[PDB]
């Protein structure tokens, strides 16, 4: 989020990390991209442009909403 | 004869007629009169 | 009319065997036998599939299931004319009887029969189902 | 066990108690019909819910009716 | 009665049978297990190591594949167990009761443990 | 024009449009003898091809940035500017059509059921009645209204079934 | 000892229109007329079970006799059509001279409404419809070399069709053969083995040493067509034959001498194609014509008629009785002789199994000269005859079925096979269950597993050949066997009857004729997916079979009878449970599994055996691309159904947009039926219900009650649009593509 903050028209966002033993060589480099650590998948819903738009900015941002909304839960 | 023309007035046999007949009529207008598209 | 008492010795058709006959419900739950008296030896067909000769005299047969035992009580009354009837026995030894319950097979009317599930109204008298609702369980208004 | 209840524009033609593969249901003497019998279904308990007997039933609407309710080894014929 | 065939109903068959540790009675039924556990145990390293995903490496794949074999008796141990819970909740052998069945899945899971340790060290 | 239509006698790519099938024709024809029977064929498709894109044209029908004939369907559209013929004159030339098939169907239906049986003079049509009523169907509309306005058209509610409710 | 004697019948019915205007006079129920839509559907239902108009057998025969008759005639007036059009619509003569760049075509269409593009260009300066049914070879091999012969054979076939159609009317209505007569079937056998098939390839045999081998031998020469002697000059004048095969100049003596040797010229043993042709050498189809009609007629003097010698087909049948299978035989000639459907259920099965080794051997051997460089014929063949074997199979399950039901009686039948089979069904069903889901899981599962492993980058593990190989080693054997046959055990054979087995392949006019195909992991994948889904149409079919007349849930499914929807919603529910059921379940499963085998015939042939010889040497139209591609899923979905499918979808503007027409129309009756199949009766009654209320308002509402459609009617209406939708897209797109690159 904080990369795609400063460039939103040529990053791709990030949904979440994938972790699955099943996977070769092949597949983890070809799953690695967006400058991660390793093999990630793209996210499709939009958050990243609705988070943007309604004034989130930083990863602390993101933990801060989601720690309230596990509490609300 | 009359058994016949009876067997001839059957459902099947009438629609075989009727529309032999429909489509005939609507294959010869297209013929003479290619491509119709608006009244004109 | 008595209620006839089941004789377990009875002997039975001559039969090869199936793999449709009795599974291990009827040694844990229940099974059924049926018996019959035969005039002459015939072949008839047996529901769990082949063909089996009848002896002549009583002939005693062994099935899973009641409908089993009915559908060769039909096939014994409508071409060979006889008067089968068949019990329930249960693995702890008791035997039930039924058909004929009272020794008249159910079409014919007889005297002394109480009627059993009989409304005294049409179907369209029902009342809706609104009607019986929250009544402590799944309930059709035909029920009430 | 399913439920069977006979209703009063019963005819008493017997046709649903021939038609019952399983002896549940019987004729009972009446007085509310010509012929003076009236079908009756004392052994429920053994009714699987073929609904023959709804077939073989000539009044209209039904005289005779099945309502498929809980299940159990004998309703469901099972023979294991 | 049932069509008989000489696959249900031979002599030589039957002997077979009776001897196998299922159905030889009068043996307890922890010592049943630990038979029954072992000959399972010590066959199901074979497939693992063979066709594994990590079959082509020299030394990884003897280890990797009767770890995995050992992985699938635990499984299979745990099986046993919540069977002998739903079944038996209330008759002539003592294997087929709560008390019975509860030690034979103990000695499965002894006894399949051994076989598949037992099947590497034939390896190495 | 209407709509941002144009047209087609004045469409750059309607033009464009005919010279491609004429092209596609033609490049099959030289494979084949001057007066083969595969070349007058040939031929006698271009004349029509050519005769299609000069009565479209002439109608003075409208074509998109496709090249293509765009129809009008919108009455008052349609009699502003003189596209009466595309939808709305056919539009009534299939009603009359279509309430002459009915007309005419719904009287021998009409007409059988006085009969003893009439179940049999269904599947055995009665030729001699329904060339009668075939006939006599080119003034449906007239008879469809009067019936209309005397009440006969349509049957009574008390006399039509209907389910429980 | 009932003598063999021709019985009939004197003027047993009376030739009168007076039921032509009665609907349904042969049943006793539809007799009376409509009252709702559901009698038109029975009308036409039962129009052919004769079995259940009447009971007598006798006069059921009579009906089956005359029905075929009807059947010949109207395959002589298709017959007919096919020589006519080939006369006058074709362009068989421009194509007897150019066979290798001119497209067979015998359909013209009429220039309407734009549809004169079907004409395509296909040589000989002649437009028409491209025709893939083999029928320019089949006429050339023969010799015909003129339209006028052509046309001689179509009046001839019309006069056939009329033959016919008198003999159903006088066997009928005139001399009605007796029951005693139908039930020779010693004497019946006698005739159609040596008289029917017998004669029938002796005469064949006197075409093909008298007209096709000479005219034959100089077309290959290169003589031109209308300077090839007639027929009949070959066959008068002896000193023509003599110049091209010699032994005619020793006439008949040979023969009767037996120096059968001195005929070596023009009887053949040689195997191998043609190479001017590509087709087999129709010397060596002369000799299995003769070779044939010797063995066949023999064949006919096996059973006894009326003079003792020969065979009792009783006897024998009880005769053969063993340890095992208590009773044997007994009873099965009696079964035999008075079902007719017991009859059509084993012809059925045999008559369609063989339609399935007609498809194999045609394209493997094939017969005629120039079928074999014409892709769009040989795909065709192989794919029409495979469908119609299909076909056929599925109903032998439908007609054994129903000889179980209606005329399968316990009293002729205690301990005998039949009996034993029945007594222990579920351990076959139980059994061949079990054989099914295992051949799924590890032929299937193998695909899965292959597309897993793919996608995952891991293709060292997939089974492959190049990796975990799955070699058909038995098959590999058995071509390696028939390919040194020649040698040692075939001694007098010159080469190998095909040129699958191995050897150098065989190139007409620029293109493959055949050459060795190889098995490898992907052959041996495929070919266990036949087994899967043969095994599976077997199990519904024979399920159906053993538990027609009753069943653990079903005990007297007999008298519900053989079509019937259910038995009620008890028992947890009843739906499907009549054999007629397990018909039209078991038709699905039939469609299924000859769909991938026409797909592996497809792809296999192009990717491997079809292409163009050039220098270099044998470019494929596929390029090879099955041994590496068709192991996964998504390898038959990209390289042969999408990449394939790239000509009918292009296909509009040419001469082929009419199969990409019937390529959508297709899909859409395929989905169409999908309606039938995935609903009930119970909702469309009651919307009709409201629409009829719309016709009683406006005093327009019919005298013939609408109903929906039955239960049954719904499951074949629903089948018999999927079926068609389904082959018919198929169908489409086999000609679309090779006809365009083939
Ligand atoms: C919604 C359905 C629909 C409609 C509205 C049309 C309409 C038309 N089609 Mg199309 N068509 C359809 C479905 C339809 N089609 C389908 C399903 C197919 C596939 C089979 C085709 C295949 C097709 C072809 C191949 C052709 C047409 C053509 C036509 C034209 C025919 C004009 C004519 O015959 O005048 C004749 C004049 C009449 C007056 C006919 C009625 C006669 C009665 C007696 C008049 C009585 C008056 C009182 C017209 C524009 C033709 C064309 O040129 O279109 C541009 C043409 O060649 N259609
Ligand atoms: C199916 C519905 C429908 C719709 C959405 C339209 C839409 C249109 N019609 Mg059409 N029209 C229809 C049906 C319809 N019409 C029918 C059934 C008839 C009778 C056979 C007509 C007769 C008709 C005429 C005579 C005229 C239009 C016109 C128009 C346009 C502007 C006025 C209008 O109708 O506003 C929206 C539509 C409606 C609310 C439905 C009723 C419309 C009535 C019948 C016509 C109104 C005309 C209007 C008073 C003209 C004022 C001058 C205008 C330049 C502003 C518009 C494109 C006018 C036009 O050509 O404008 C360029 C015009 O002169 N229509
Ligand atoms: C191969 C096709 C074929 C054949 C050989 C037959 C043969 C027969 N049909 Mg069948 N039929 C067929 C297809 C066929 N049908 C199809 C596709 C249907 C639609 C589902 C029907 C519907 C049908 C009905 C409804 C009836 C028959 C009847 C008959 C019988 C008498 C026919 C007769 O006298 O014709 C005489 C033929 C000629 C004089 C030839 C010239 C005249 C024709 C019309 C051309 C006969 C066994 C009738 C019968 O009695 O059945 C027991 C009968 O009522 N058929
Ligand atoms: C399996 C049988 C069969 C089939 C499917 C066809 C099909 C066809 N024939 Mg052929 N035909 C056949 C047998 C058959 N024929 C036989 C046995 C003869 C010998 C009498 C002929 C003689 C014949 C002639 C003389 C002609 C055709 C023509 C046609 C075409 C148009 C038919 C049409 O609409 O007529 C009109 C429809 C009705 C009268 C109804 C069509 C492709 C025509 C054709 O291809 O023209 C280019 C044509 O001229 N056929
Ligand atoms: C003109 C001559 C003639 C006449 C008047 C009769 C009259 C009679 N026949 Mg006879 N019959 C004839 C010729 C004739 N037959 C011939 C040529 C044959 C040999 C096939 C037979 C074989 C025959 C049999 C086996 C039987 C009769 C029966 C009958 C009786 C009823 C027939 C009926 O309802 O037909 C009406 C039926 C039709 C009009 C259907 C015609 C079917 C033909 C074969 C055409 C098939 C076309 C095919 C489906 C095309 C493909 C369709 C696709 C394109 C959609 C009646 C006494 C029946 C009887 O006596 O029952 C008690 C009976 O069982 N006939
Ligand atoms: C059924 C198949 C068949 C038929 C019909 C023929 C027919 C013929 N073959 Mg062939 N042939 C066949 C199979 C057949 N062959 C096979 C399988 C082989 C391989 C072994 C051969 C090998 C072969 C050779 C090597 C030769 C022939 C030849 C012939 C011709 C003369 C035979 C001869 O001398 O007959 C002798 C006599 C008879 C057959 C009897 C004729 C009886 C007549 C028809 C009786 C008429 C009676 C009547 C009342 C009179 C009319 C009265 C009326 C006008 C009023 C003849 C056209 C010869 C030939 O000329 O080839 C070009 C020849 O050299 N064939
Ligand atoms: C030699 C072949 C043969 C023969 C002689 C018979 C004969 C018979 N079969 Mg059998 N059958 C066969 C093959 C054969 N079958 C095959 C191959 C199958 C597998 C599909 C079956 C499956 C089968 C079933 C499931 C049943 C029969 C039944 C019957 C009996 C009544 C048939 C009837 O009334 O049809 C009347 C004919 C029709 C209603 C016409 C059907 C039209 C089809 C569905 C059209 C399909 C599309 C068309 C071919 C192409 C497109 C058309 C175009 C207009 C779009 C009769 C004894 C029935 C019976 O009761 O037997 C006791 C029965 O239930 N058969
Ligand atoms: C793609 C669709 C599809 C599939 C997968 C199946 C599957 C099956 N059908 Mg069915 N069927 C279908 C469509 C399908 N059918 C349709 C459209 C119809 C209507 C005409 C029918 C009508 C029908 C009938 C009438 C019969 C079958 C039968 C069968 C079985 C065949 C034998 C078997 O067990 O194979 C093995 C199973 C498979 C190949 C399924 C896929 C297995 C995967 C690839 C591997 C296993 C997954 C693995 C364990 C991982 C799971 C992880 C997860 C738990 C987290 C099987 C369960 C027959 C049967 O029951 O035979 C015993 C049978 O009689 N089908
Ligand atoms: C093979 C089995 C042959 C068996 C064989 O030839 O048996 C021979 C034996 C014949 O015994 P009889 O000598 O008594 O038979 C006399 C005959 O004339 C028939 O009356 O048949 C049976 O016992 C019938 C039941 C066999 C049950 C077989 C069960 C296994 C089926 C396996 C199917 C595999 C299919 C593979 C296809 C390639
Ligand atoms: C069942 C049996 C069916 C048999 C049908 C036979 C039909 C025969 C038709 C052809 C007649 O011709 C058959 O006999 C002629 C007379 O010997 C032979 O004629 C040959 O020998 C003649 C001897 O004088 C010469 O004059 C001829 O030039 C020469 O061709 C033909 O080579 C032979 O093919
Ligand atoms: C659509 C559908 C129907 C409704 C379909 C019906 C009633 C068939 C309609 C057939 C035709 C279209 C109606 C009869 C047409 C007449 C012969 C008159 C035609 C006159 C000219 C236009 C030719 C069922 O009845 C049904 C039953 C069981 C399972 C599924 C379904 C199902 O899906």
């Known amino acids: 989020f904080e990369q795609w903050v400063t460039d939103p028209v040529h990053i791709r966002p990030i949904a979440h990390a994938i972790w699955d033993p099943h996977f070769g060589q092949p597949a983890v480099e070809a799953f690695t991209r967006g400058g991660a650590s390793g093999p990630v998948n793209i996210s499709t819903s939009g958050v990243y442009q609705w988070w943007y738009t309604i004034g989130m900015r930083t990863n602390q941002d993101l933990y801060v909403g989601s720690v309230f909304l596990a509490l609300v839960s | 004869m009359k058994d016949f023309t009876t067997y001839l007035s059957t459902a099947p046999v009438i629609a075989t007629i009727w529309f032999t007949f429909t489509a005939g009529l609507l294959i010869e207008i297209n013929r003479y009169f290619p491509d119709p598209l608006v009244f004109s | 009319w008595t209620v006839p008492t089941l004789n377990p010795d009875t002997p039975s058709p001559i039969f090869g065997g199936s793999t449709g006959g009795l599974l291990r419900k009827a040694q844990t739950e229940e099974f059924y036998v049926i018996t019959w008296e035969a005039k002459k030896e015939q072949i008839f067909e047996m529901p769990t599939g082949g063909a089996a000769i009848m002896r002549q005299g009583p002939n005693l047969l062994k099935f899973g299931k009641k409908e089993q035992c009915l559908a060769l009580t039909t096939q014994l009354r409508n071409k060979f004319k006889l008067t089968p009837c068949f019990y329930r026995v249960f693995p702890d030894g008791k035997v039930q009887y039924l058909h004929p319950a009272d020794g008249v097979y159910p079409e014919k009317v007889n005297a002394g029969r109480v009627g059993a599930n009989q409304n005294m109204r049409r179907i369209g008298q029902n009342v809706n189902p609104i009607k019986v609702k929250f009544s402590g369980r799944m309930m059709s208004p035909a029920e009430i | 066990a399913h439920i069977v209840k006979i209703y009063d524009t019963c005819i008493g033609c017997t046709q649903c108690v021939r038609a019952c593969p399983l002896d549940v249901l019987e004729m009972v003497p009446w007085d509310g019909c010509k012929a003076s019998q009236m079908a009756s279904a004392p052994r429920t308990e053994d009714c699987v819910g073929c609904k023959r007997c709804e077939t073989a039933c000539p009044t209209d609407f039904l005289s005779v009716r099945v309502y498929l309710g809980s299940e159990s080894t004998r309703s469901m014929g099972l023979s294991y | 009665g049932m069509l008989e065939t000489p696959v249900t109903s031979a ?35 074979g497939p693992f190591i063979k066709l594994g995903p990590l079959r082509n490496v020299p030394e990884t794949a003897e280890i990797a594949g009767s770890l995995s074999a050992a992985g699938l008796v635990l499984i299979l141990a745990l099986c046993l167990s919540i069977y002998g819970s739903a079944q038996f909740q209330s008759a002539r052998d003592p294997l087929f009761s709560a008390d019975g069945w509860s030690e034979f899945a103990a000695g499965f899971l002894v006894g399949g443990e051994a076989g598949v340790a037992w099947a590497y060290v034939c390896t190495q | 024009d209407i709509a941002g239509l144009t047209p087609c006698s004045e469409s750059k790519a309607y033009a464009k449009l005919e010279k491609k099938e004429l092209k596609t024709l033609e490049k099959r024809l030289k494979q084949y003898e001057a007066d083969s029977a595969p070349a007058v064929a040939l031929k006698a498709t271009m004349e029509r091809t050519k005769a299609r894109f000069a009565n479209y044209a002439k109608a003075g029908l409208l074509c998109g940035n496709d090249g293509l004939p765009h129809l009008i369907a919108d009455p008052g559209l349609a009699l502003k500017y003189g596209h009466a013929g595309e939808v709305f004159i056919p539009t009534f030339g299939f009603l009359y059509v279509a309430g002459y098939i009915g007309y005419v169907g719904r009287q021998y239906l009409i007409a059988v059921k006085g009969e003893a049986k009439p179940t049999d003079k269904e599947i055995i049509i009665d030729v001699p009645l329904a060339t009668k009523l075939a006939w006599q169907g080119a003034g449906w509309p007239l008879a469809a209204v009067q019936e209309l306005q005397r009440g006969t058209l349509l049957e009574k509610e008390e006399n039509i079934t209907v389910s429980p409710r | 000892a009932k003598k063999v004697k021709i019985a009939v019948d004197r003027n047993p019915v009376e030739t009168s229109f007076e039921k032509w205007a009665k609907p349904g006079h042969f ?210 004048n002896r000193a023509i034959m003599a110049d091209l095969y010699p032994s005619f100049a020793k006439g ?20 191998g194609l043609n190479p001017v042709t590509g087709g087999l050498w129709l010397s060596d189809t002369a000799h299995h014509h003769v070779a044939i009609a010797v063995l066949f007629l023999v064949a006919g003097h096996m059973y006894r008629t009326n003079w003792g010698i020969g065979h009792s087909m009783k006897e024998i049948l009880e005769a053969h009785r063993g340890p095992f299978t208590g009773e044997g035989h007994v009873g099965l000639y009696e079964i035999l002789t008075t079902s007719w ?152 054979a010159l080469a190998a009857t095909s040129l699958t087995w191995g050897g150098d392949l065989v190139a007409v006019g620029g293109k493959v004729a055949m050459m060795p195909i190889s098995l490898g ?190 239960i049954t009617q719904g499951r074949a209406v629903g089948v018999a649009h999927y079926l068609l939708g389904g082959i018919a897209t198929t169908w489409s797109f086999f000609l679309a593509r090779i006809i365009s690159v083939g």
């Open chain 5, 11 to 45: 002599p030589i068959v039957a002997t077979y049978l009776s001897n196998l540790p299922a159905y030889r009675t009068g043996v307890a039924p922890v010592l049943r297990g630990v038979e029954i556990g072992l000959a399972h145990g010590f066959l199901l390293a």
């Open chain 7, 27 to 236: 049943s006793r129920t539809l007799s009376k007329g409509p009252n709702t839509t559901t009698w038109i559907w029975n009308l036409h239902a039962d129009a052919h079970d004769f079995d259940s108009h009447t009971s007598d057998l006798e006069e059921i025969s009579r009906k089956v006799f005359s029905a075929h008759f009807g059947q010949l005639g109207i395959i002589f007036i298709w017959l007919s059509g096919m020589y006519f059009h080939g006369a006058r619509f074709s362009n068989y003569e421009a194509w007897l001279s150019d066979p290798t760049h001119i497209k067979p075509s015998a359909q013209v269409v009429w220039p309407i409404v734009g549809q004169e593009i079907l004409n395509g260009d296909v040589g000989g300066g002649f437009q028409g419809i491209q025709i893939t049914s083999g029928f320019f070879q089949l006429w050339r091999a023969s010799g015909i070399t003129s339209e006028l012969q052509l046309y001689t054979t179509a009046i001839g076939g019309l006069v056939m069709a009329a033959a016919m159609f008198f003999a159903g009317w006088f066997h009928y209505h005139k001399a009605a053969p007796k029951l005693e007569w139908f039930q020779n079937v010693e004497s019946m056998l006698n005739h159609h083995l040596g008289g029917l098939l017998g004669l029938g390839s002796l005469a064949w045999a006197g075409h093909q040493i008298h007209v096709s081998l000479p005219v034959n031998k100089l077309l290959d020469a290169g003589v031109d067509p209308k300077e090839i002697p007639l027929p009949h000059d070959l066959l008068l």
């Open chain 7, 252 to 271: 008949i003596a040979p023969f009767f001498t037996l120096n059968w040797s001195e005929y070596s010229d023009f009887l053949t043993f040689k195997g």
């Open chain 7, 341 to 492: 459907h017991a009859q059509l259920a084993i012809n059925l099965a045999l008559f369609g199994s063989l339609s399935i080794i007609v498809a194999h051997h045609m394209y493997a051997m094939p017969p005629y000269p120039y079928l074999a460089t014409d892709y769009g014929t040989q795909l065709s063949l192989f794919t029409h005859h495979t469908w119609i074997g299909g076909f056929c199979i599925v109903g032998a399950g439908a007609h054994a079925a129903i000889f179980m039901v209606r005329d399968y009686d316990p009293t002729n039948n205690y301990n005998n096979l039949l009996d034993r089979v029945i007594r222990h069904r579920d351990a076959i069903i139980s059994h061949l269950n079990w054989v099914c889901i295992f051949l799924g899981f590890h032929s299937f599962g193998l695909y899965i597993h292959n597309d897993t492993m793919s996608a995952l980058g891991r293709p060292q593990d997939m089974f492959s050949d190049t990796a975990i190989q799955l070699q058909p080693v038995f098959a590999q054997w058995i071509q390696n066997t028939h390919f040194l046959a020649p040698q040692l055990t075939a001694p007098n």
């Open chain 7, 521 to 710: 992991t992907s052959d041996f994948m495929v070919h266990h997916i036949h087994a899967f889904t043969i095994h599976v149409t077997v199990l519904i079919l024979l399920k159906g079979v053993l538990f027609a007349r009753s069943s653990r849930l079903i005990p007297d499914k007999a008298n519900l009878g053989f079509r019937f929807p259910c038995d009620g919603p008890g028992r947890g529910g009843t739906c499907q449970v009549s054999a007629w059921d397990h018909v039209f379940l078991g038709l699905f499963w039939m469609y299924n599994s000859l769909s991938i085998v026409i797909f592996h015939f497809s792809w296999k042939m192009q990717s491997d055996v079809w292409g163009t010889v050039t220098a270099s040497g044998v470019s494929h139209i596929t390029g090879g691309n099955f041994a590496q591609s068709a192991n996964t899923i998504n390898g038959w979905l990209r390289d042969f159904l999408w990449a394939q499918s790239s000509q009918v979808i292009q296909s509009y503007g040419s001469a082929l947009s009419a199969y990409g027409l019937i390529f959508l129309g297709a899909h859409f009756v395929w989905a169409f039926s999908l309606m039938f199949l995935f609903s009930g009766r119970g909702y469309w009654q009651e919307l009709i219900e409201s629409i009829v209320w719309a016709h009683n308002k406006l005093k327009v509402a019919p005298a013939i009650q609408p109903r929906a459609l039955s």
